[PDB]
Amino acid sequence: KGIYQTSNFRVQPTESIVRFPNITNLCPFGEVFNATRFASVYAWNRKRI
Amino acid sequence: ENSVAYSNNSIAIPTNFTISVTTEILPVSMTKTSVDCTMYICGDSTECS
């Protein structure tokens, strides 16, 4: 006769959530991949991303 | 310092008294703490457990 600590229990998490700020300030890929022109093959031109 | 006024035929007898009321404080019990050892060491990680 008595009381015995058989186990410990935990509520398992029902969902996983991920939160970050509003997704502003992207790089200008249209200035390279959607450009109206591209440099000579002997003289390839570089920009920054 | 107090030299007691003893001599071989001298006695001091109380003629009146005070009832004191002191105060003794004793601890008796800790907080009955228990620990889920795996939650402390490894909580939310089966790869740790």
From Swiss-Prot, chain A:
Attaches the virion to the cell membrane by interacting with host receptor, initiating the infection. The major receptor is host ACE2. When S2/S2' has been cleaved, binding to the receptor triggers direct fusion at the cell membrane. When S2/S2' has not been cleaved, binding to the receptor results in internalization of the virus by endocytosis using host TFRC and GRM2 and leading to fusion of the virion membrane with the host endosomal membrane. Alternatively, may use NRP1/NRP2 and integrin as entry receptors. It comes from the Viruses. Binds to host ACE2. RBD also interacts with the N-linked glycan on 'Asn-90' of ACE2. Cleavage of S generates a polybasic C-terminal sequence on S1 that binds to host Neuropilin-1 (NRP1) and Neuropilin-2 (NRP2) receptors. Interacts with host integrin alpha-5/beta-1 (ITGA5:ITGB1) and with ACE2 in complex with integrin alpha-5/beta-1 (ITGA5:ITGB1). May interact via cytoplasmic c-terminus with M protein. May interact (via N-terminus) with host bilirubin and biliverdin, thereby preventing antibody binding to the SARS-CoV-2 spike NTD via an allosteric mechanism. Glycans are attached at T14, S16, N22, N34. Residues 10-26 are annotated as: Disordered. Changing G30H: In strain: Omicron/BA.2.75, Omicron/XBB.1.5, Omicron/EG.5.1. This is Spike protein S1. It comes from Severe acute respiratory syndrome coronavirus 2. The chain holds residues 310 to 358 of 1273 of the full protein.
